[PDB]
Amino acid sequence: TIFQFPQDFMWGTATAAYQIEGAYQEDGRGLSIWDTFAHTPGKVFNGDNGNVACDSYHRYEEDIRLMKELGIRTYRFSVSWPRIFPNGDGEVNQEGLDYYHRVVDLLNDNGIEPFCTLYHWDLPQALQDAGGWGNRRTIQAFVQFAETMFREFHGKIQHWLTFNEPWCIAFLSNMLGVHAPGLTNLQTAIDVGHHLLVAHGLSVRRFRELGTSGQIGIAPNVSWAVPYSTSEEDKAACARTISLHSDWFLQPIYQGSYPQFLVDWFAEQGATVPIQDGDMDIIGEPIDMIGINYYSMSVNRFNPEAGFLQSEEINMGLPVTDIGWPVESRGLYEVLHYLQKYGNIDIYITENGACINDEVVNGKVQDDRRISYMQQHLVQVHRAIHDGLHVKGYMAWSLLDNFEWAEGYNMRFGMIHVDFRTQVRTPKQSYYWYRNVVGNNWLETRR
Amino acid sequence: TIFQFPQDFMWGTATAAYQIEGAYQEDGRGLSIWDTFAHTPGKVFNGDNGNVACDSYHRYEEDIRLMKELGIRTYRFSVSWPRIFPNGDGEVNQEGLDYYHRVVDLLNDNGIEPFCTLYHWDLPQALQDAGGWGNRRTIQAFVQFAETMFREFHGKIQHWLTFNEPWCIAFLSNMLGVHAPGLTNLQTAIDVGHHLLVAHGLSVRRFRELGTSGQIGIAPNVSWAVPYSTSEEDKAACARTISLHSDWFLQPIYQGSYPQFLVDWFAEQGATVPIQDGDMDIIGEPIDMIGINYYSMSVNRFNPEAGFLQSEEINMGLPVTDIGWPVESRGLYEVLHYLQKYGNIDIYITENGACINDEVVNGKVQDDRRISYMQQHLVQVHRAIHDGLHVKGYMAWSLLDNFEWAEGYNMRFGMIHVDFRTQVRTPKQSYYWYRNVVGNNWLETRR
Amino acid sequence: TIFQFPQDFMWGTATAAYQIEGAYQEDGRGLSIWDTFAHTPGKVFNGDNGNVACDSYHRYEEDIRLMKELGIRTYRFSVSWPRIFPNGDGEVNQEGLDYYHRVVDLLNDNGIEPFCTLYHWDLPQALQDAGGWGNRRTIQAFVQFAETMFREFHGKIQHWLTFNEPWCIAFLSNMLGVHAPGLTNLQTAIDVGHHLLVAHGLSVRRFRELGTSGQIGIAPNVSWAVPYSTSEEDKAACARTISLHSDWFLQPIYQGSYPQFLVDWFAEQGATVPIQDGDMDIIGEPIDMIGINYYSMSVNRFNPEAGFLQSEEINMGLPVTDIGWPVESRGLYEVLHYLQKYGNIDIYITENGACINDEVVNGKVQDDRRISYMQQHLVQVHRAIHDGLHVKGYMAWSLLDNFEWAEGYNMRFGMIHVDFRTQVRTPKQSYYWYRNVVGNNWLETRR
Amino acid sequence: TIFQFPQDFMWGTATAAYQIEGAYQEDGRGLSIWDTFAHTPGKVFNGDNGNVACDSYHRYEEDIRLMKELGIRTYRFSVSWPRIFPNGDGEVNQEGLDYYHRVVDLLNDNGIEPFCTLYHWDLPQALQDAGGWGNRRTIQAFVQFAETMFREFHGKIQHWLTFNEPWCIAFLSNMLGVHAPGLTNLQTAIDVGHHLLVAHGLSVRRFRELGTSGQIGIAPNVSWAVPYSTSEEDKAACARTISLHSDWFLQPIYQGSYPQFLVDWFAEQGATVPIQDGDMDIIGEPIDMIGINYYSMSVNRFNPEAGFLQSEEINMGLPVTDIGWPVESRGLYEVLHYLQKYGNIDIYITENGACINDEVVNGKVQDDRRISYMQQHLVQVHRAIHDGLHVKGYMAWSLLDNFEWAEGYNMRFGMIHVDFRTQVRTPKQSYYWYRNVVGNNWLETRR
């Protein structure tokens, strides 16, 4: 079947600062909560860390030349907060800003639109020492960081994202303790979540006041769960799983309130959102679009012992990627329609890809399973567009294999293989497949 | 996850006469429309035919010993009509009956409940020469065939199925011309479909009048399609695809009428159901259960040029089995719930399996993909049962690799590999996996 | 180096009833706590169970012919209690006794001395329903079981073992809940341990009173731990680890009391040994020898959170077998000397071997790692003998690959490979290596 | 398990001049006893010699860049005596000194602390012609060589070692005749041993008098043997084996006398230490630390025919490296504690590694066995430190595969593979494993 995409559909790739840059102590860069987390025994597989990574701090010219020959139109990357404000102290580090100027100018020189993610989990450790995100003072610090970026890169960046995956920053990091700072306290996670939102709203307001060019939004990772049974409890368990990922952040932004159920659910566990007068009005600041990050879908059932959401995921026996996630692309189509509850808003698939660990053999990386995964999901994207939904673009998660957080370098997601012993780049077969798709602007599934 | 099945869940395997028996001219067996079809150049891949097949006419003792060590509780097989009535002439062939007596006695001797399919596509050619199924006289002939079986095997067979997949017998065979007798005429397909139903109702009535022991039903192959778009036309295209497979045969049986839409749809193409007074009352004869045959699910859209149903199947990019069918087990769960429109009737999964062509290597057949397929579908079965649906059993399509109709022996579906050069049987890894599942009565999915 | 063994050193192999026999419902056999445990979802890997196993209930003639060509002088096997007393009810099952008569007569016919283990974990479920081992009534039942065996096989069996690994029966099964009946209660484990001892003493007394021919003892699995540091706490942690395995059962038998430390240790956790007047005198019944079961050694340190013994095992980085146990043969030499605290008693290495999962390739099983493991341990045995210690024999754990309890059939320990799909036996290379060693009565290590 | 090392633990790598340098006749270098020994038929496997070797005389910049990216903090190398004093004649060769200036400056430029071994077996042949080490005149010559180095590299080298493995220089070379000069005379070996000690003491005294910066010590290869039996004779055999390697050199240095037993032992064979007035006082010169070289451990027994020490090593069947040495890391922990008899002195593991001959395949050297070996020994190092012992650093024996003395290039010990046909360097997998360990400063053992 032939799937033809819109004339101005935006094709791209994505990365994150700490996962590819390296040079963690270079040019005055301060430490982030992830440097600390990764340097702690038992937090990251094999003791891997973001020192060096893909050394993209030095090899960005090569990476850009590679994405250029891919035919891509945009590149999503994030800004290392501690490279700009080593202590989130207000004392700017020009060397840090200069790095992004080099990357951005080279991007614009190659006709590639920068898609800037301001916050991709690397909160300066100095700020964490005072409570990081748990402390409202951090809100003011982010706004200064954001404003600095808006003033410095005005006209050079037309697409901005305040936060990448609030659910991970708040709950995965402060409730489940899997990501930095690795805490396990419901109240703290809720505090972090609320403060991210306020910080987001204020940043958007400054963006507007400053007259910065471009559009600005936020990029939540979206979840999707379907009930194992037709029971009301299973249905409720799925509602919680889905809502905590998107609705808990999007309802405040689009409708001015936290999902009541869940608020009640958390109250039962003794937790309450630290809402202060004016907060909700701030969070309700209008945004131009949102980024959606999708990887998988699940079948859940109510289970009193299954985590703080009492929602158990059933292993349905579907094949999984090398990181253990089942592939079921329909979830992307289902959640895109679900999200229409906020209106037919502009949506970019900022994140989508698969962990496939195939290595270089005979000079190539035969990652057929990655091609298969991307094909299936791009079909759902076309399907959504065909339903009249405003899905504006797609960004393959990761141009390069990189530091996959707590998994270390063991889990590869790139379309370009990186041998971390030499830093040599080897485009995978998925890279050439993707180059053809973006170049033609249409896709074909064949037996 | 652990999936525990009901105490009396019935585990089994299935085959069909023409696909495994062989000895096509032995002991007075007459020719069937499939012998004719297969002996015709261009009808079956490579010119393969049912002569010999798995030679189960002679090797049934071995097959039964193999299903016995599998721990199975029932065996679904079909009766070769032309072995009983070489010409559907009324002149019984005792040698034919004796074969099934040997098979059935051996089954009962091994504590394996026979699950008898009366009609599995092998209509005697003599009857086809007069119009086969298109001629109402064939209705009377089937009833005699059926009655003969009820009288001869009373008490030895407690589970009976009149027809296996009416949609294939009628439409696939008489409209699409893919299966014997290979015709391409809408009206003839509709005539065949209607006559099968009348023949089914009369057989059930005789079953009741004779006081034959056991339960009796019919086994349609069920289809499931989901709309590509949210459009009303795509929705209608899916309704036609789904209904023609099940509803067109089940609504008459359970509710006394053909689905009105479709009737109108066919009328537009100039075709009408040849309904005679009393027909619908006959077809409405009460049945004890139904067999459901499921293999795949599809995503469709309306397309004026896509066949007589104008329903186009979209290639979503999902991986497929070796015969080309996508695996998406949710379809089984969806259609089981769909079927509740007829009430919470007793349902047996009479057919489910996958074409996986792995051969014997190092003494074994590592058919992991078949195990994966079966695991996924058994989960949906447990899921349906958990929803309170009366799914009573499951029969893995084919104990043995066999004659896969128009595909010939090229497409293997067995849990037991058969080398057609020697007739040697080699249990596949799926066989040992299945033996463990049925033996334990529960299933476990693991990463 | 050449290691020459004593003229009358006894070479053998070992198995256990539930792990090899199969025919779990045949000839009136009752259910054991292990049938129940294995038939419970989540208790044994893959849902494996002892139904069938190595089908040694039917294939013992072949197994014996194979051990015969091995040149072995004894065969250690266990008696299925529920085959003799289906309900531990007192109602003897002659068919059960007849099975062991066939095995024993064939052994004696082949010049192979039976080495009978009375209790190898298969307590009749009927007895467990009343408290099994936790109920003193079980003590009386075992004595009847034991007495029945002494009377029935007098003169045919000259070597008897009451219990195999009391530590597993009590603590692993009732405190850690890893083995049947899978309980997690300190007090219950201590009760079981004490009752096994009383049952052991009474059985030995009856053995003496009846004048049964042969020698009788008990076979504990011995542990060995060395301190990570020179600290007194690490030293204490190792003392607990070592003593609970052997001393907690041997001190009562040889010296008339439970190790005081440990008694105090358990008292701190609120547990006390249910000692009744006369118990200790009973347990102190004189025995002829003991069987020692050894597999591995460990380096431990004190850790308040490391189990009920607060003894943490350090992963020193040594290579491990396929079941995960490090190989360090010196432990056998160290514990044999440690055990001299009870005098220079007759000791048989009733258990020693390694989990090596090599399969049949090119008609053979190249299990070099098993040969390496056995060579290393036989050297320590020679070493102990050379020190004047009375180590009388050695029995390779398992003639055959079998049901490895909670690991199922996944973990192979045999010197003879068993394909569970066919029950075909294939002697591994270790088998031929062992045949040469036992035949020559000496061993040689070479570079 | 996680093993975290001290904040200032010193990680490094080690090599030796004659084993890596090459350019044996370049820039006025004189011949050493090893050039002579290697150029003699039958002395070194395949007639291999140190001409060329790793050509590190020319390729040191590359080697240093490679150790730099390893994250190492020190580099142990030795000085070719004949490059400095071609004839040990007193006539300095500035070109020789300039080479080490280039190496040392590059090391300091890269933040790598030089760890200088003055004597690593390459005695100038001119000196051997007069008796080499057997002639006291050689003592004066070494002191001049040493002094020259102290004066020339003052402030550039803060870590010095006078002699590397006195046992090899004396006994292996002059009694067993395995290493240059290849003599077999007990008295001569004892003379060499004593003269090395005097030369060592005088060098240390000059070091002190000159005010040279840094610390100075000696690096003996330590042996460890455990008795096969509990007999007093086996115990004595092990004492001799252990003491001749370390105590015979360390007791004189730390306590002012040769181990009395052994002195008596050698007297029985007619040999006496040529001690002159003042010698012992000289040898007793205080040192700052010692280097310990460890590779293996053994189990020995007394045997009148087993060499001049009548100590036979038993082949216990443990797996060995490719050069034939068993791996048993506990020996390192045992000897470190044994050495405390001299007080809790500063100890550096100057040598530790394994001969693993894996070659380059698919662009890499999968030397997993080397990683396994290093992991096991680093654990014992952490273990010793945890016991309060002052183990200050660890140096992996050999950055590069090199000339392994009498074994030639056949036995590879490097973490970096060197193809001697091209001199191409290929970092082995152990290199990347080590880079991660040193970088993190902690180690983790995993199943």
Ligand SMILES: O=[N+]([O-])c1ccc(O[C@@H]2O[C@H](CO)[C@@H](O)[C@H](O)[C@H]2F)c([N+](=O)[O-])c1
């Ligand atoms: O420059 N300033 O003086 C300044 C002060 C507070 C600012 O912001 C304020 O910060 C507080 C924490 O310190 C939060 O509690 C308030 O919600 C936030 F509006 C900002 N800003 O966000 O642009 C700027």
Ligand SMILES: O=[N+]([O-])c1ccc(O[C@@H]2O[C@H](CO)[C@@H](O)[C@H](O)[C@H]2F)c([N+](=O)[O-])c1
């Ligand atoms: O034995 N008989 O005389 C006899 C006759 C017609 C019989 O059946 C009749 O057959 C006709 C075709 O010949 C159909 O049109 C009728 O619908 C059917 F009732 C049956 N029967 O089905 O049991 C038996």
Ligand SMILES: O=[N+]([O-])c1ccc(O[C@@H]2O[C@H](CO)[C@@H](O)[C@H](O)[C@H]2F)c([N+](=O)[O-])c1
């Ligand atoms: O045959 N009998 O009447 C009989 C009774 C109690 C017997 O044994 C007794 O059993 C009690 C539990 O019922 C335990 O509490 C006693 O410790 C035990 F001596 C025995 N015996 O062990 O030989 C035999």
Ligand SMILES: O=[N+]([O-])c1ccc(O[C@@H]2O[C@H](CO)[C@@H](O)[C@H](O)[C@H]2F)c([N+](=O)[O-])c1
């Ligand atoms: O420069 N010198 O005249 C000189 C002389 C003898 C020296 O050293 C002397 O050498 C003798 C052999 O020739 C040895 O027997 C003595 O033990 C040693 F002290 C030294 N020195 O070691 O520094 C220097």
Ligand SMILES: *[C@H]1O[C@H](CO)[C@@H](O)[C@H](O)[C@H]1F
């Ligand atoms: C989107 O998910 C991927 C996969 O876990 C992460 O690597 C990114 O950081 C996240 F934003």
Ligand SMILES: *[C@H]1O[C@H](CO)[C@@H](O)[C@H](O)[C@H]1F
């Ligand atoms: C069920 O479907 C299978 C696969 O096409 C066929 O072989 C059977 O005959 C049918 F009843």
Ligand SMILES: *[C@H]1O[C@H](CO)[C@@H](O)[C@H](O)[C@H]1F
């Ligand atoms: C000795 O240990 C082995 C290995 O776990 C078990 O299979 C035996 O039953 C036990 F007695």
Ligand SMILES: *[C@H]1O[C@H](CO)[C@@H](O)[C@H](O)[C@H]1F
């Ligand atoms: C330490 O031992 C290694 C291995 O034999 C040698 O290559 C070194 O020269 C020695 F110092």
